[PDB]
Design a binder for this molecule. Sequence first.
Ligand SMILES: CC(C)(C)c1nc(-c2cccc(NS(=O)(=O)c3ccsc3)c2F)c(-c2ccnc(N)n2)s1
Length: 267
Amino acid sequence: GLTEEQRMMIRELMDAQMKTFDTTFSHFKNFRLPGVSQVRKDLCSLKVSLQLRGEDGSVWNYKPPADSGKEIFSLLPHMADMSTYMFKGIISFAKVISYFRDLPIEDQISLLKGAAFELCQLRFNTVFNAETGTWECGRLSYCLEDGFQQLLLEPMLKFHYMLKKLQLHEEEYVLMQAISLFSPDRPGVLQHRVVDQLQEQFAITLKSYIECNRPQPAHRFLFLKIMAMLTELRSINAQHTQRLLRIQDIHPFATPLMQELFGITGS
Ligand SMILES: CC(C)(C)c1nc(-c2cccc(NS(=O)(=O)c3ccsc3)c2F)c(-c2ccnc(N)n2)s1
């Protein structure tokens, strides 16, 4: 069984998640849409078509082009708007958690800058349909273009399929978010020991939750698999930060919030 402090910790994380995760994406609006050397390699990894289902029942569908000049950039303003919406939710999530509110403001900033991408991807995994290869974001859908084995070569995509296969509960997703947010080794963190102890507590709570609620042979080593996925997600984070910085170098597109989170100064 979980201790009372562990149950309290899960309840606080679950409360934060329900208050700040717009799972129907109902408040995502006014976003941009595509017009009616190494950077080229970066942009060709994630090929998705886009579908918008109107409230009236109409459907708009967008297929992207092939790498033939600037057409490589057509989906960037939209994805920047979606990422920014997601990041705002992640910041709200962190800010309503007491363990986070109690850290120095500078460490709050450093932890969010370290983890925003990772928590965004963890939330996106919960709307991933692995059978159809689509992220279902309310009236918006992102569908992977046509194989499956070739798609698992891209580390982000393999991440989403492998995490979805673990069939996690909401509670395990929110503890993954907590363990990623409270990483004591993000650059600029001052309360290294406080953050390390918090992270350890969240990981212990996760290990115990799995021990108490998941007896099936399929869930053996589940805790260790989850921690391996978090390590992989940190590596994916570093790689995509580099991709973003290269693209932004050649073709500015980051929103103000993305600039803040990725360290771009405006000069
Ligand atoms: C929502 C899904 C999971 C479908 C996506 N997720 C990213 C994604 C990938 C990497 C990073 C981010 N976030 S980020 O760094 O602020 C950013 C925003 C625009 S470039 C970088 C993402 F949202 C996508 C993306 C980004 C750019 N092009 C294309 N074709 N797909 S599709």
